[PDB]
RNA sequence: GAUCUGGUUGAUUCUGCCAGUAGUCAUAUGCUUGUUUCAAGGACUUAGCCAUGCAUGCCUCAGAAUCACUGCAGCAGGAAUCUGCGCAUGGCUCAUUAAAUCAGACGUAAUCUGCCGCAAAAAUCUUGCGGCGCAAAAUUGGAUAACUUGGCGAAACGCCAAGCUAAUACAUGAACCAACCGGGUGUUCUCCACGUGAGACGCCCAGCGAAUGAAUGACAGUAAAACCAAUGCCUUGGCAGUAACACCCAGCAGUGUUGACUCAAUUCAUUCCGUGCGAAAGCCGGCUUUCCGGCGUCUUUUGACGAACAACUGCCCUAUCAGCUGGUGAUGGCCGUGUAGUGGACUGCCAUGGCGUUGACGGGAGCGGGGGAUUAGGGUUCGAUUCCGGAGAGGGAGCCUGAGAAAUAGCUACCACUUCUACGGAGGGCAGCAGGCGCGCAAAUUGCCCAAUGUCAAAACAAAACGAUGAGGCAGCGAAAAGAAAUAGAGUUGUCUUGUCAUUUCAAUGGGGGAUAUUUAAACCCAUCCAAUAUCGAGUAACAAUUGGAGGACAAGUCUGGUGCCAGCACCCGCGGUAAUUCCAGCUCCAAAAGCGUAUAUUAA
RNA sequence: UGCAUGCGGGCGUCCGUGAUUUUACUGUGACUAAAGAAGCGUGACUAAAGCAGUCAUUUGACUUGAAUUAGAAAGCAUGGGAUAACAAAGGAGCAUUUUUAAAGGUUAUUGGAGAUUAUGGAGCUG
RNA sequence: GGAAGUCGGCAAAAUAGAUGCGUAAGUUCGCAAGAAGCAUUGGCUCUGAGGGCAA
């Protein structure tokens, strides 16, 4: 039905100026939700600055120069999202879409042999024709023979090459977790306990490295490692630790004065 | 046309709802099938999403099941004999779901003979004996099979799927409708 | 239509239009600081009222309130940076003691006159509007430019000004052209 | 809610009484809402009894809830 | 800035209103505007009526060219046209609308869902040659456009007939290669029996999806023995063990999910028409039954984008609106029908319910929020209008196609209005953008452009080779509103320390004129400059500031003329009847100032 | 692909039985589009704005920034229990445990699986 | 055609049964009222509902 997306109605995380235009690139249906994605045109133009405008972005994208999950994507309206590996082989760029501690999309540079690995959270388990178990992930992947120990909420370590699952991280207490929604999006902590409310939203209580307690809904967490020290993924600069606002302002003022 | 919306209905307070939009295609209804006994006549209906509903105007045969035996056969519909909605549907020989019909009992007699060796290869003789041992047949069903007409309940919706499948009446339900058919 | 460029007012008229005490006080300020109209004073009045309204709200909060700490620090930083308050006074209570002359003394027109670059405040006004005054090598033509303390030492004649290191002005140039023709 | 009427067949009307806060006057009003609830024959509630009701699909023009538990 | 003041009395102290006062992205009107930035802009009244023009189309290497088309000499480009996708978005408006819509918070296990992501696919005796046999890279079929011929018609975003020819249009159709698994059977044959028998071999079926039945879709409060028939073992009579299973698989599911399921999925029986299912019998590239890649499509399935439904709490005034609903559905029940699905949504039958002073029903004004104004605080008030939601396309209805419309720059009918005509007939829908006409107190250009932002799409850009886009942007008009900011500055001497007056001398700068230029899609503004060898310009700086006032409220004249309860002023108190602090003027002064009055609403007071 | 297998209590996971206490209020936490309103930083010459930009001055840094808030009521989790609310009762309208023995009257385990039996647990009374 | 006839609608015409909806001013609240109006009626073949008496 809806084909357009007003720029005011667009997600604020896209960092689109209200005076630049009426419209924003509407994400197509795909791996990620419209509200929880970053379209390729925004990435290639507003973030990587490789394209000065949409015309140059179409030149780059429709040539197949941008690979997402080791696959050329020729649509600038393609929704790229959390944990997606973006590669530009002609310029040697390898990013993974992560959330910084402020809940904004961050392009974390990836080395080789780790751009092959993508973490996917299991959102549903079902049985297909012929009695084959299928695990549906947060990015829309359907895996036809997952680990027998896989449960909803677990993270599957996936190799984008060879299309193979390589490891399973279960969603239990004490596991490293990153928050993918709400006010705590981008923060990283360990699961101290999960409060279960049948028929309603479960609450996960988390403790970051500094010891600060915070909670979210169980659907918003994303297991990323055995412990805070042993993360299976590379995280942004802040390491998921939320700094005090007053302390952050003082540090920025000191740094600005230092450069002056 | 026909609408399934609640706009025209009175509120629980008795108030008259002031409709402030035109009728939508999403809330549409269509005329009933009014399926009757006869040679199979079927009209497709293009439904929402591009899918097709089979509107049965006439049906003659159906796939009827014997639940206790876990088998089914494609038998002919002889007559419709009872309808819980209206006697005027039995009179017009209208086929709807849950109406009681009389179906041919010849296929069920043949299957019973070929499965248990009972009229109503020595390995097959032993197979028959093993099947009979714990098996018991209702007298009411057997009496109907000998007569040639069994009572069955329509379990499909002819106006939706275009087919009249059903199940033979057994036990208390058979006695319930035998009482209401004398 | 579909333009989202915000804008707001920066001044308000006094509630009592004809109050002799207010009229005489504002006449004193206009003559003393060489202001064009009362609107410049009332713009300063709104700036002060917003600062004092913010301070009164913060001083209500407990002294350890995080919002009071953050915004109280910012308010004191702004007052010290623009010279409204001296560095000796660091408490939020001293913001409430700010007066209209405190802000007016920080205007580029007053600063230029006090610095000795102009003979009067009116000479300062025309010098600024005629592109003769530069703050940190940047020509400023706005008399209401509020000078920061850090920028106060960097105020001098513009390098492109006839009084700085630029070409001769209009009357000398026109006189030279007339002499060449003559 | 509390059972209000049991005059229909296998259906009851319950009433949910609550206080609504009027911001201007800093005070409350007593308000009520009536719900038509399907009552299973597993329960025999009487007027004045407190019941727990769960939301189901539309079962009639007005019924959206089912009786789950009765407390005398 | 948590503020008041004038008027009731001969004076006083109250109550109390009237008047004064400040703001409004509140409008309109009057007078006046030199710069510069930023902006609302036919909502109000008539969801009134509209001339004209333009607003939605799309081609790659990669669906179909024999233009009697153009270049080159078969290679390229290719008008038309068929085919595939879109036209259900955007834009406009606010008429309807109070258990509605909407907001926050929930649900769909009650459902549909093209394009997009990740997946799945073993049914289906076909073709050639010969006469059933032998072989296999399936060398399938009939049309129809454009085009030609004849044309009809006044025309018509009107048509007829015949002749050609395409497909990724339509239709048909693929054996073996090619598996695992199961259910019925045979008076089949080999064995063991002396039949709950074991093997083969033969025959019907055994794919996804759909229908109807039948199972599974777990257990999770008791320990010990004996006997009988069948059967596993160790042993040649027992019970030490021990997943299960009469080989060819000695572990090829004894284990789906949820809070919950009649759901997922598996097995058995029967059924599947045309209203399902090709390896499009498809198209391009490289390396040469050559094999590699790209994208294109049928069906199955579930994520995503949505759609539709339901409704937890809330939402103006009115009782000079107290009962409302229930033939012909009102509240509930039963079996159905219908739906994509739930449902009195609807047929039949049944029962009397259901709602209402905690205001139902009815009437009145309203699109709903996010939000605007004003505000010490609490409040009051506005919200047609950019974003979200809803609804409509003159008024109603109905519908086709399609994943999605009850679509309106789609169709059908009626009503009203209206256009062309050759009189036989054919059309129209600006509450899209410009523009008109009316209406009004009241609201711009019949402009330029796809450069940016997006949408669609066969599509990156380029190369003979430029997709559309009144969405949108840019300019014109535009004192709605908002920001900055000119109309002069320094002295000289004299006159009446400062300060007036005359003149008298220095500089400075823009308004404006231009440019090697800059900007811009192109222009235009803004910025830069008045030589860098080399560039115009203030003295009455005539480059001349206005709008209201001068008894009080309320800042500013006991001035001078005129008029004489007249003319007139006056928001209120009042002034004016010959010496007017108030009218008409002059001078002087006051307030705000490129702004200042007036009217009407609204907030404060 | 046995390429396998081994070198008395307290947990946590699910079921089955066993007398039941909420709500208002208040503190934390979640879940909550922008635009708009507060607000951090930032000499777009200032400002109304905007979210930019800044600094080296050989091809690039700042692993640049774009922080934080408030937002009615209702809905969600959890902590506190003073003040209250809802419900119940109306007080004769009401309610001991633990040893032992003896008497009576469709479960595991017996190598599975299909009957039959009897033996006891365990409850039921006395 | 429809009261133009005539003193005058005199005379004639017209309306009609039953059933279901519906029914205004005024009123002494009883009426007005069959107000006014609008619908259906045949034949045939069926289907429901409405009982008595015994065990
Ligand atoms: K081409
Ligand atoms: K509601
Ligand atoms: K089935
Ligand atoms: K039903
Ligand atoms: K464009
Ligand atoms: K006079
Ligand atoms: Mg759920
Ligand atoms: Mg009979
Ligand atoms: Mg008096
Ligand atoms: Mg008086
Ligand atoms: Mg007197
Ligand atoms: Mg200029
Ligand atoms: Mg100009
Ligand atoms: Mg077509
Ligand atoms: Mg449309
Ligand atoms: Mg729209
Ligand atoms: Mg196949
Ligand atoms: Mg399915
Ligand atoms: Mg009643
Ligand atoms: Mg139904
Ligand atoms: Mg405003
Ligand atoms: Mg509005
Ligand atoms: Mg209106
Ligand atoms: Mg408009
Ligand atoms: Mg519409
Ligand atoms: Mg329409
Ligand atoms: Mg139109
Ligand atoms: Mg029309
Ligand atoms: Mg127009
Ligand atoms: Mg106007
Ligand atoms: Mg426009
Ligand atoms: Mg100039
Ligand atoms: Mg411009
Ligand atoms: Mg005065
Ligand atoms: Mg006189
Ligand atoms: Mg101006
Ligand atoms: Mg903002
Ligand atoms: Mg007549
Ligand atoms: Mg007469
Ligand atoms: Mg006569
Ligand atoms: Mg008579
Ligand atoms: Mg009456
Ligand atoms: Mg009468
Ligand atoms: Mg009558």
Q: Are B116 and B132 in contact (CB under 8 A)?
A: yes
Q: Are B106 and B64 in contact (CB under 8 A)?
A: no
A16, HSE (Cβ side, Cα atoms, 13 Å): 24
Q: For residue D61, list chain B residues with Cβ-Cβ distance below 8 A.
A: 6, 9, 12
3-class state of residue A60 by DSSP? helix
Look at phi and psi of residue D10 and say left if phi exceeds 0, alpha if psi is from -120 to 50, else beta. Answer: left
Nearest chain A CA: its distance from C69 CA (Å): 8
**Residue A77: which of A90, A85, A93, A66 has the closest Cα?**
A66
For strand F, is any atom closer than 7 Å to the CB of C7? yes
Number of H helices, E strands in chain B: 6, 10
CB neighbour burial string for A26-36, b if at least 16 within 10 angstroms, e if fewer:
bbeebbbebeb
For strand F, is any atom closer than 7 Å to the CB of C74? yes
3-class state of residue B70 by DSSP? coil
Ligand 11: centre distance to CA B86 (Å): 104
Question: Does any CB of chain A come closer than 8 Å to the CB of residue C66?
Answer: yes
Please tell me the distance from the alpha carbon of residue D18 to that of residue D30, in angstroms, as a whole number.
6
Q: Are A128 and A144 in contact (CB under 8 A)?
A: yes
First to last CA, chain C: 59
**Please, which residues have CB within 8 angstroms of residue C105's CB and are 6 or more apart in sequence?**
C83, C111, C114
This structure's resolution (Å) is 2.7
Which method was it determined by?
cryo-EM
C134: how many CB neighbours lie within 10 A of its CB?
Answer: 18
Secondary-structure breakdown of chain D: helix, strand, coil percentages, each rounded to the nearest 5? 0, 60, 40
**Please, which residues have CB within 8 angstroms of residue A83's CB and are 6 or more apart in sequence?**
A96, A97, A98, A118, A119, A120, A138, A139, A233
Q: Are B63 and B165 in contact (CB under 8 A)?
A: yes
User: In three state form, how does the secondary structure of A164-224 look?
Assistant: EEEEEECCCCCCEEEECCCCCCCCEEEEEEEECCCCCCCEEEEECCCCCEEEEEHHHEEEE
**Which of D36, D61, D62 should we substitute to test contact with B (largest number of B Cβ atoms within 10 Å)?**
D61
**Please, which residues have CB within 8 angstroms of residue A78's CB and are 6 or more apart in sequence?**
A27, A28, A30, A39, A40, A68
Greatest pairwise CA separation for chain B in angstroms: 79
D12: how many CB neighbours lie within 10 A of its CB?
Answer: 26
Question: Does any CB of chain B come closer than 8 Å to the CB of residue D58?
Answer: no
Q: Are A53 and A25 in contact (CB under 8 A)?
A: no
Look at phi and psi of residue B37 and say left if phi exceeds 0, alpha if psi is from -120 to 50, else beta. Answer: beta
How far does the CA of B110 sit from the C1' of E582, in Å? 125
């Amino acid at each position: 039905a809806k084909k357009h997306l007003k720029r005011l109605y667009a997600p604020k995380d896209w960092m689109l100026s209200k005076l630049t235009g009426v419209f924003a690139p509407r994400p197509r249906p795909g791996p990620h939700k419209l509200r929880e994605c970053l379209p390729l045109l925004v990435i290639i133009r507003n973030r990587l600055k490789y394209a000065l405008n949409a015309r140059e972005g179409e030149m780059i994208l429709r040539q197949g120069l941008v690979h997402v999950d080791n696959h050329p994507r020729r649509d600038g309206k393609y929704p790229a999202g959390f944990m997606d590996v973006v590669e530009i082989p002609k310029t040697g760029d390898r990013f993974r879409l992560m959330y910084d501690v402020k809940g904004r999309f961050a392009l974390v540079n990836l080395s080789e042999a780790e751009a092959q690995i993508k973490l996917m959270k299991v959102v549903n388990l079902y049985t297909a024709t012929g009695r084959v178990p299928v695990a549906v992930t947060h990015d829309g992947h359907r895996i036809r023979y997952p680990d027998p120990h896989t449960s909803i909420g677990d993270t599957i370590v996936y190799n984008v090459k060879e299309k193979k699952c390589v490891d399973l991280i279960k969603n239990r207490q004490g596991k490293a977790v990153i928050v993918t929604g709400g006010a705590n999006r981008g923060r990283i902590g360990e699961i101290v306990k999960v409060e279960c409310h049948p028929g309603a939203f479960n609450i996960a209580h988390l403790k970051d490295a500094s010891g600060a307690e915070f909670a979210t809904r169980a659907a918003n967490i994303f297991v990323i490692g055995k412990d805070l020290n042993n993360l299976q993924v590379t995280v942004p600069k802040q390491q998921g630790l939320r700094m005090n606002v007053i302390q952050e302002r003082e540090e920025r003022l000191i740094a600005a004065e230092a450069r002056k | 046309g026909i609408v399934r919306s609640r706009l025209h209905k009175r509120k629980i307070t008795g108030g008259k709802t002031k409709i402030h939009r035109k009728r939508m295609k999403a809330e549409l209804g269509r005329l009933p099938a009014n399926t009757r006994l006869g040679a199979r006549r079927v009209s497709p209906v293009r439904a929402r999403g591009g899918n097709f509903k089979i509107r049965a105007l006439r049906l003659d045969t159906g796939n009827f099941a014997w639940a206790s035996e876990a088998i089914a056969h494609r038998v002919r519909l002889l007559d419709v004999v009872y309808n819980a909605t209206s006697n005027e549907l039995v009179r017009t020989k209208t086929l709807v779901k849950n109406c009681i019909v009389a179906v041919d009992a010849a296929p069920f007699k043949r299957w019973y003979a070929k499965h248990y060796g009972i009229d109503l290869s020595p390995k097959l003789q032993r197979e028959w004996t093993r099947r009979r041992r714990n098996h018991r047949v209702e007298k009411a069903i057997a009496d109907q099979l000998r007569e040639g007409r069994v009572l069955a309940r329509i379990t499909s919706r002819p106006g939706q799927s275009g087919r009249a499948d059903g199940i033979l009446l057994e036990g208390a339900e058979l006695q319930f409708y035998l009482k209401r058919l004398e | 239509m579909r333009n989202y460029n915000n804008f707001n007012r920066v001044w308000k008229a006094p509630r009592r239009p004809f109050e002799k005490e207010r009229l005489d006080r504002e006449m004193k300020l206009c003559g003393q600081y060489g202001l064009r109209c009362k609107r410049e004073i009332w713009r300063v009045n709104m700036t002060l009222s917003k600062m004092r309204r913010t301070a009164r709200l913060l001083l209500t909060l407990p002294e350890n309130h995080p919002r009071r700490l953050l915004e109280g620090s910012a308010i004191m930083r702004r007052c010290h940076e623009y010279g409204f308050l001296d560095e000796e006074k660091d408490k939020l209570d001293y913001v409430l003691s700010l007066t209209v002359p405190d802000i007016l003394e920080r205007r580029l027109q007053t600063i230029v006159f006090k610095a000795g670059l102009a003979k009067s405040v009116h000479h300062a006004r025309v010098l600024i509007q005629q592109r003769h005054i530069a703050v940190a090598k940047q020509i400023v033509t706005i008399p209401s430019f509020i000078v920061r303390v850090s920028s106060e030492r960097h105020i001098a004649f513009a390098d492109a000004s006839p009084f700085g290191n630029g070409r001769t002005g209009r009357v000398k140039r026109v006189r030279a052209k007339a002499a060449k023709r003559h | 809610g509390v059972v209000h009427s049991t005059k229909m067949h296998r259906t009851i009307i319950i009433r949910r009484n609550y206080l609504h806060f009027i911001k201007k006057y800093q005070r409350y009003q007593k308000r009520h809402k009536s719900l038509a609830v399907h009552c299973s024959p597993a329960f025999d509630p009487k007027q004045g009894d407190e019941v727990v009701i769960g939301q189901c699909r539309p079962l009639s023009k007005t019924i959206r809830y089912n009786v789950l538990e009765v407390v005398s």
